[PDB]
Design a protein around this ligand. Structure first.
Ligand SMILES: NCCC[C@H](N)C(=O)O
Ligand code: NA
Ligand code: NA
Lengths: 458, 450
């Protein structure tokens, strides 16, 4: 129409530019589906789309960042503030419903009956009152998870299929919506102003540990998981699925592993089982990988590598060396030292200690890759003056990608309430590395976390 | 070419045209587009949102949500859903910490260290909380580590008609209501019934040694009953329920027609009806103490209606006695969704027994309709229809109907009802369904004596 141009203003120009971002991003997402020769996904189909279990392309993830940011900004601009804030206040409800239907096994039950089940059958099988379960299901269905095929007859759709026990994402969805995460957010303010739990970032003083203490539990997160049967393996699968659902394997496509000389060494410092190094070695057979972690984890990793990629052990392309990376330096003269989701778990002093340990082991050919969210400040000046190798949100998105980069900030807050740690900005990382005589090179954007590269300064 | 591509482009068209019409709604009041960085309220922030704006927002939000969820991988969307507890947690925390009033006293903005000193919260932790809110357009960072209010955080000021409902919905009691929902639902005592003392909230409160209803619990907490009453009023105001005045055709009733505000408390709704439509007479009926309070309220806010003999007050227990007879309109709002079927049918038969052949009953409540394609395709023509290709209905655009129902379950052990549920109850009370009057929030369903 003409409503953006009849009585012109800067605000109308910004609305029209948001509309342009939405339209062009949607067309680019269509192009991504065309590139893979796939049709557009359906929210009513009862079977997965071919790309549901595939690594999302970098282009699709960047597109979605812009599309989600622009849609969110457009709606929040045009709606009355009380409307948006009321909806925010009720956003706890959908994750509550997800946890409830996971506990009730609704999605596997519906997978046994793909054409759908009447709500009385679901009630008989779950033990939940049929109208209460229908209330839960309809809130999820309104949000495109499950579907109502006839009145009071419910079926799976492509979003509820992520809740099947076999998928790679059900465990992280179960953990993030689960009772432990709900306890972590139950008394956040009280923990933050508590004279003992408030002032420090100590591991045993998170809001989760505060809630556990307040209910009579003695022990940290670790101990709490150990006391819950089958919960440590649940947490491990959840971490793996958190990496998978976020498309972190796009590392393999962003950093130029193919341009490293044959025989180059990648030291996966603190890589646990080496789930990343194993993919690097599988995809780039000209590289050698070194897994370093705690001795027990190193034995688990030897078994894991024997399971999944014995060829690397037979070819002498994988090596394993135990380490406590706070007390000893890693193996020297590696071409790459890779640390992923390690810095955001420790305070500044321990990080500087680890960074100095890494720096002491490096040669002129060495570099350090840090895989972590970059939790940038949200003022216009910080965003404008960021390093040009960082992705920049297009006009008129603000702050940055807005909701399009939500997981950087929901991640940070999660780190606070569950682990009492924090994500850091690019400036924070540069300052820590500079204290360890490491000079910044550039950011390798994964459209989720970022891989920042540093080299020995002197 | 493909149906999926055509649906994506139809969603784009819905987004474009709905945004255009939202702009037209701002132009109609000679207002510019609101700003997400401005430190002062937009002139329409405290105004009743027009029916047209709420309609286009239903479409715009439903279409944006459906577009993003269609194009994103399911794991991406579900991961973001799984983290949706965090923003309300942050809202509750900044409310308890008083960040918005503090920033109101210093409109330029405050450094994070000043906010930390004033709130007792570590500055980097407070910064994490604030930045999650700010990414969602609540508050803003004007300079690095210097934060200020914006138009969304202004809703958190103590004087607003929305801060109390936001405080309640994000607060500790509501967090306890969603703590153990599954366990409550499969428990053989809490699961099978809708008894007031068997809600998921009460299930969680048992672990503190409490047992009773929500009303009992509120009376154990200092200042909780008053905060709850303020929150209910503010929930009504912030949802634009006063669009009742603009949807039901009060001006098409003949002068002298009577409106019986049944269970209307102080008469907050009927006093606005009486002011906008002086040709109507209002009869307010509620509990005796409430009726005396309402007399005081009307003497303070609309004494002309008392001088002109346009408002009457008659105490009632509407489960035990019939309302005053032969009124043109009987109006009940947010009552049915608080009671079970048997009590509702009792109240409806009481109302029916008082009606004359010309009387109508208006029920204001959410219509928690079924979401299958057949129910939606064959719904009553008076219901709003979501345009192609929105599904189910308006999708996320009508979220508050379905977050309302779930809220009623976990906090109150009650439920919203579908249109068919309402029609069946009223038919059991010898009331025939006429039509729905869409408020673009709740709905007002009309019934007549059969
Ligand atoms: N016959 C099916 C009734 C479903 C109807 N749309 C309702 O939700 O009221
Ligand atoms: Na649970
Ligand atoms: Na704007």
């Amino acid at each position: 129409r003409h409503m953006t141009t009849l009585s012109p203003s800067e605000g109308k120009a910004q609305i029209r530019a948001l509309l342009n971002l939405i339209n062009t991003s949607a067309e680019q997402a269509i192009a991504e589906y065309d590139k893979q020769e796939c049709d557009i996904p359906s929210l009513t189909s009862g079977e997965p789309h071919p790309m549901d279990d595939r690594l999302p392309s970098l282009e699709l993830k960047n597109t979605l960042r812009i599309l989600e940011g622009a849609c969110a900004q457009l709606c929040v601009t045009l709606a009355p503030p009380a409307h948006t804030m009321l909806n925010y206040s009720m956003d706890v409800l959908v994750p509550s419903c997800i946890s409830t239907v996971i506990q009730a096994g609704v999605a596997p039950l519906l997978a046994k009956h793909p054409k759908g089940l009447h709500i009385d059958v679901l009630s008989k099988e779950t033990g939940i009152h049929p109208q209460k379960l229908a209330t839960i299901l309809r809130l999820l269905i309104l949000n495109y998870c499950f579907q109502e095929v006839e009145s009071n007859v419910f079926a799976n759709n492509r979003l509820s299929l992520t809740l099947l026990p076999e998928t790679s994402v059900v465990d992280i969805l179960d953990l993030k919506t689960g009772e432990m995460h709900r306890k972590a957010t139950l008394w956040v303010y009280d923990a933050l102003v508590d004279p003992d739990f408030g002032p420090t970032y100590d591991g045993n003083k998170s809001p989760l540990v505060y809630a556990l203490r307040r209910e009579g539990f003695d022990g940290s997160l670790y101990d709490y998981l150990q006391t819950q049967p089958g919960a440590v393996a649940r947490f491990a699968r959840a971490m793996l699925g958190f990496s998978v659902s976020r498309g972190l394997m796009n590392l393999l496509n962003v950093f130029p592993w193919q341009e490293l000389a044959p025989g180059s060494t990648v030291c996966d410092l603190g890589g646990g089982n080496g789930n990343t190094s194993i993919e690097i070695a599988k995809k780039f057979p000209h590289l050698k990988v070194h897994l370093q972690d705690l001795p027990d984890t190193i034995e688990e990793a030897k078994v894991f590598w024997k399971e999944e990629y014995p060829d690397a052990i037979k070819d002498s392309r994988v090596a394993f060396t135990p380490i406590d990376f706070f007390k000893q330096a890693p193996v020297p003269d590696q071409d790459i030292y890779y640390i992923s989701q390690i810095v955001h778990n420790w305070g500044d002093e321990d990080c500087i200690t680890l960074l100095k340990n890494i720096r002491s082991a490096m040669s002129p050919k060495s570099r350090l890759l840090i895989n972590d969210y970059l939790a940038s400040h949200l003022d216009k000046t910080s965003i404008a003056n960021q390093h040009p190798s960082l992705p920049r949100a297009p006009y008129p998105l603000s702050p940055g990608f807005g909701r399009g980069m939500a997981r950087t900030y929901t991640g940070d807050y999660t780190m606070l309430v569950v682990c009492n740690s924090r994500e850091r900005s690019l400036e924070d990382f540069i300052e820590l590395c500079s204290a360890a005589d490491l000079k910044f090179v550039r950011v390798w954007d994964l459209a989720e976390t970022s891989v920042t590269e540093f080299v020995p300064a002197h």
